[PDB]
């Protein structure tokens, strides 16, 4: 063993050890229980930072602690390759999309191998692949036939300039990001996924994942937004009739999810876009100039709740059906046409928006629910007017008296009745978008025939490839401009016929990858069954919070849909989320690296992120330190949820104590080389030994818990650390003080071995020769806990009587019942009562 750490030599030497060994190269092996470690995979950014490295650095010290525990560990990395940054790449480099994607994959797979993750790479998979895409293509047409996938028109934001759709992120102020034209609304044929019919699914299978963080799954119950509500209709009133056609004549139907305050309507409001608002407007320019200026504005609800409320009266009236009062309609920009009825009843004595709606306008407000002697002010909004639980109905004729949930359903029972209203469920959840007119995704697998129809590609002529030697222009989809893409024959007729040239949200790649990485190289369908049976579900996730609603909402609705096909047996993808904080870097600038610099502005500390260029290289931290300072540095500056701040003293820190691993290990063996490690029957040993085997299994179990159970790895390091600052303070010379230390160096190195596998792996040949991954997760040997037992005096009114033997656990009332049954105590107490017994633990009890 040579004397001092050196990470540039034995770092690729134990990658190669494991690479060799094939550890991380894994089957379906019923011969081990699986355990399946997935770290979200990367888009192709060009080069990895230290976000990535803490990403997987995670991923791979949980990994590497269930290996040590026998299980059968599939811990799979692949590459999210579709998308717009090598659109963006391909349109400054001039270079395919392709081309720009495989050279950044490569790079980063290096950089990867070099941090020494114990990854399969047998089943590294590239979404860009047609060996990839095709299987979502195929599922595709699939959920086409079954209407689950459909066409429909749709909305989008046209750049007349660019001559391109684009998001809402790239639409500032109403114009175009890169062309600041102003654009236009336009309604286009695209496809979407029916999710909306597997919401209740989606939101109740919540349940099921006992071991998911709870502000999650509140976070997918808020988007899905279920609502139980009452569907009401008012009567349009005799006078209020003119322009209106069909049903929009006899009734305004509204939803409400407060059907109990129906006696305290005020008045009632519509969307712009509601028949009765453009019957009103016929004559009166104001109104027309009121629904124009809502048409232009957006509906997004990040304008939605700051926006101020705004409307106008109609001279409409529709009747209340359960008092009989005319109600005036007012058109608002609030109310959003297309959820629920386009329409809603007003109630400002206890929703607080309709409460300043009407302040503002004085409208009246009628109070109809009461929660105790809470006085009730018509000028001021308190807190409790809006309360569901502890609330009870007033001037509401025979509802009076009632809470939320009886009078809900007497109202229910009492609209039904007279036909008026009836129950109904909401949800704010919409149908999934899928087309996007963009070229560097997967191609949607649908011809367009003037004969047949929109017809899905049969999937004997699956995958539509998507052309590799294509560069982007920024002006409009390539593909739509390639004749030699789109034209082609109808597969029902045979005749002449278009490919659709839309590709798919990239969001649908990263919806099924983990069940590919079962079986990447399966070619007869999405996942093969003896792989799904074996693999299951994902046992452990790890990736950052900020995806913990549209990726997870997705992922879990493709699961179903898979399940549904007989694909794979399991209802839900992922058993267990870690969501790790975020690393943050100084920021300099014109954004500059960090690297770049010496000690430009100096701006301040923020997340690690390709916007500001803050990314610190992780190949500039292995060439000067090497991997194991980099895992250790990430799991030791923070636990895993809380942010980490890049510091270079931080660095410092890691290799020097990887130095002291180091020089204990070499300082051990250069003072006698190896042993057996003691074990056994540990009577007979020294104080000082004794306490270092305590410290030793009380280091082993509580390393145990935090990487088992509580997932908090930079404790697990400090408890290893005071394991050797005990064993620096230990005489370890003697024969058995030898055998002890053996089994402190041995147990350490492989209580970090998941950190820092490579300082360890090495070590650990040093010290033994066995294989580490055959020896296994170090034991704890439970009498190595227990201390040694005490004596203590028995006293009766002062005098000693007898003597008892107590453990050092025993609490005061084990020494005073102790006490009172010595023998010595029994035939000096007299059978009289103890007026008080004094117990001074360690020492002795007296009873008086
Ligand atoms: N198209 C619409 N535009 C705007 N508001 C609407 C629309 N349809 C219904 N509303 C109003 O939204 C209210 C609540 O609907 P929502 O789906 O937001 O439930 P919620 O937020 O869970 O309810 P709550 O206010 O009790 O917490 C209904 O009482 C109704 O007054
Ligand atoms: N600064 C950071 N600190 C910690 N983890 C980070 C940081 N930046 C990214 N990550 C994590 O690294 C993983 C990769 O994220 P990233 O945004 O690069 O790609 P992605 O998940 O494929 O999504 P997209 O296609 O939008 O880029 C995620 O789990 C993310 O939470
Ligand atoms: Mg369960
Ligand atoms: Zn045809």
């Given at each position: 063993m040579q004397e001092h750490y050196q990470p540039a030599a034995i770092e690729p030497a134990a990658q190669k050890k494991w690479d060799d060994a094939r550890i991380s190269n894994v089957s379906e092996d019923a011969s081990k229980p699986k355990y399946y470690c997935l770290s979200m995979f990367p888009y192709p950014s060009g080069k990895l930072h230290m976000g990535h490295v803490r990403n997987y650095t995670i991923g791979d010290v949980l990994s590497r602690f269930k290996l040590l525990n026998g299980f059968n560990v599939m811990q799979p990395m692949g590459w999210d390759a579709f998308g717009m940054p090598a659109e963006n790449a391909a349109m400054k480099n001039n270079v395919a999309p392709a081309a720009w994607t495989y050279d950044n994959i490569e790079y980063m797979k290096t950089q990867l191998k070099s941090l020494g993750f114990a990854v399969d790479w047998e089943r590294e998979v590239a979404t860009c692949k047609p060996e990839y895409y095709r299987w979502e293509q195929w599922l595709f047409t699939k959920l086409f036939e079954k209407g689950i996938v459909y066409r429909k028109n749709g909305t989008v934001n046209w750049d007349p300039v660019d001559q391109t759709v684009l998001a809402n992120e790239q639409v500032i102020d109403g114009r175009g990001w890169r062309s600041g034209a102003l654009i236009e609304k336009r309604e286009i044929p695209m496809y979407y996924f029916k999710i909306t019919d597997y919401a209740e699914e989606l939101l109740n299978d919540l349940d099921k994942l006992e071991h998911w963080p709870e502000q999650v799954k509140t976070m997918q119950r808020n988007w899905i937004g279920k609502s139980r509500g009452m569907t009401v209709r008012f009567a349009?009133?005799?006078?209020?009739?003119?322009?209106?056609?069909?049903?929009?004549?006899?009734?305004?139907?509204?939803?409400?999810?407060?059907?109990?305050?129906?006696?305290?309507?005020?008045?009632?409001?519509?969307?712009?876009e509601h028949p009765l608002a453009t019957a009103a407007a016929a004559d009166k320019p104001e109104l027309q100039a009121f629904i124009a200026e809502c048409k232009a504005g957006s509906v997004a609800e990040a304008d939605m709740a700051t926006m101020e409320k705004k409307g106008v009266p109609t001279g409409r009236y529709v009747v209340n059906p359960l008092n009989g009062d005319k109600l005036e309609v007012w058109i608002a920009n609030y109310v959003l046409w297309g959820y629920g009825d386009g329409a809603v009843m007003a109630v400002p004595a206890h929703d607080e928006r309709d409460f300043?709606?009407?302040?503002?306008?004085?409208?009246?407000?009628?109070?109809?629910?009461?929660?105790?002697?809470?006085?009730?002010?018509?000028?001021?909004?308190?807190?409790?007017?809006?309360?569901?639980?502890?609330?009870?109905?007033?001037?509401?004729?025979?509802?009076?008296?009632?809470?939320?949930?009886?009078?809900?359903?007497?109202?229910?029972?009492?609209?039904?009745?007279?036909?008026?209203?009836?129950?109904?469920?909401?949800?704010?959840?919409?149908?999934?978008?899928?087309?996007?007119?963009?070229?560097?995704?997967?191609?949607?697998?649908?011809?367009?025939?003037?004969?047949?129809?929109?017809?899905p590609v049969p999937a004997d002529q699956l995958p539509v490839v998507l052309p590799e030697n294509v560069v982007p222009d920024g002006m409009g989809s390539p593909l739509a401009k390639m004749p030699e893409f789109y034209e082609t024959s109808c597969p029902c007729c045979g005749g002449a016929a278009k490919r659709e040239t839309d590709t798919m949200d990239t969001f649908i790649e990263s919806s099924?990858?983990?069940?590919?990485?079962?079986?990447?190289?399966?070619?007869?369908?999405?996942?093969?069954?003896?792989?799904?049976?074996?693999?299951?579900?994902?046992?452990?996730?790890?990736?950052?919070?900020?995806?913990?609603?549209?990726?997870?909402?997705?992922?879990?609705?493709?699961?179903?849909?898979?399940?549904?096909?007989?694909?794979?047996?399991?209802?839900?993808?992922?058993?267990?989320?870690?969501?790790?904080?975020?690393?943050?870097?100084?920021?300099?600038?014109?954004?500059?690296?960090?690297?770049?610099?010496?000690?430009?502005?100096?701006?301040?500390?923020?997340?690690?992120?390709?916007?500001?260029?803050?990314?610190?290289?992780?190949?500039?931290?292995?060439?000067?330190?090497?991997?194991?300072?980099?895992?250790?540095?990430?799991?030791?500056?923070?636990?895993?949820?809380?942010?980490?701040?890049?510091?270079?003293?931080?660095?410092?820190?890691?290799?020097?104590?990887?130095?002291?691993?180091?020089?204990?290990?070499?300082?051990?063996?250069?003072?006698?080389?190896?042993?057996?490690?003691?074990?056994g029957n540990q009577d007979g040993l020294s104080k000082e030994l004794k306490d270092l085997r305590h410290k030793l299994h009380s280091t082993t179990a509580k390393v145990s818990d935090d990487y088992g159970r509580r997932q908090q790895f930079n404790t697990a390091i400090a408890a290893v650390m005071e394991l050797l600052n005990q064993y620096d303070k230990t005489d370890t010379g003697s024969e058995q003080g030898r055998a002890v230390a053996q089994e402190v160096l041995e147990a350490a190195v492989r209580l970090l071995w998941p950190i820092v596998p490579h300082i360890c792996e090495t070590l650990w040949s040093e010290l033994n020769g066995a294989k580490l991954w055959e020896a296994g997760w170090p034991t704890v040997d439970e009498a190595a806990l227990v201390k040694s037992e005490i004596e203590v005096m028995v006293q009766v009114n002062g005098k000693l009587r007898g003597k008892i033997t107590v453990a050092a656990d025993a609490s005061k009332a084990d020494l005073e019942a102790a006490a009172l049954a010595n023998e010595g105590a029994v035939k000096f107490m007299e059978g009289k009562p103890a007026k008080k017994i004094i117990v001074v633990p360690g020492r002795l009890v007296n009873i008086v």
């Open positions: 349009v009133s005799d006078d209020s009739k003119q322009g209106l056609e069909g049903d929009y004549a006899k009734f305004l139907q509204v939803y409400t999810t407060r059907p109990d305050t129906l006696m305290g309507a005020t008045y009632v409001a519509v969307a712009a300043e709606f009407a302040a503002k306008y004085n409208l009246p407000k009628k109070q109809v629910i009461a929660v105790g002697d809470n006085a009730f002010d018509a000028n001021r909004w308190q807190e409790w007017y809006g309360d569901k639980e502890n609330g009870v109905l007033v001037n509401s004729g025979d509802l009076d008296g009632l809470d939320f949930q009886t009078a809900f359903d007497a109202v229910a029972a009492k609209l039904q009745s007279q036909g008026a209203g009836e129950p109904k469920t909401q949800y704010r959840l919409r149908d999934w978008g899928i087309s996007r007119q963009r070229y560097w995704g997967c191609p949607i697998p649908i011809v367009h025939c003037e004969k047949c129809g929109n017809v099924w990858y983990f069940f590919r990485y079962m079986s990447p190289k399966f070619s007869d369908g999405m996942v093969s069954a003896e792989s799904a049976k074996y693999w299951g579900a994902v046992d452990q996730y790890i990736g950052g919070i900020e995806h913990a609603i549209l990726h997870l909402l997705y992922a879990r609705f493709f699961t179903k849909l898979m399940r549904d096909e007989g694909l794979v047996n399991v209802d839900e993808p992922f058993e267990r989320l870690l969501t790790q904080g975020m690393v943050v870097c100084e920021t300099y600038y014109d954004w500059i690296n960090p690297a770049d610099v010496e000690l430009v502005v100096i701006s301040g500390t923020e997340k690690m992120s390709k916007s500001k260029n803050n990314g610190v290289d992780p190949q500039e931290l292995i060439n000067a330190y090497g991997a194991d300072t980099a895992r250790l540095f990430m799991m030791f500056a923070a636990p895993p949820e809380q942010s980490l701040e890049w510091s270079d003293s931080g660095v410092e820190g890691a290799h020097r104590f990887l130095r002291r691993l180091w020089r204990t290990v070499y300082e051990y063996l250069k003072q006698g080389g190896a042993v057996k490690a003691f074990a």
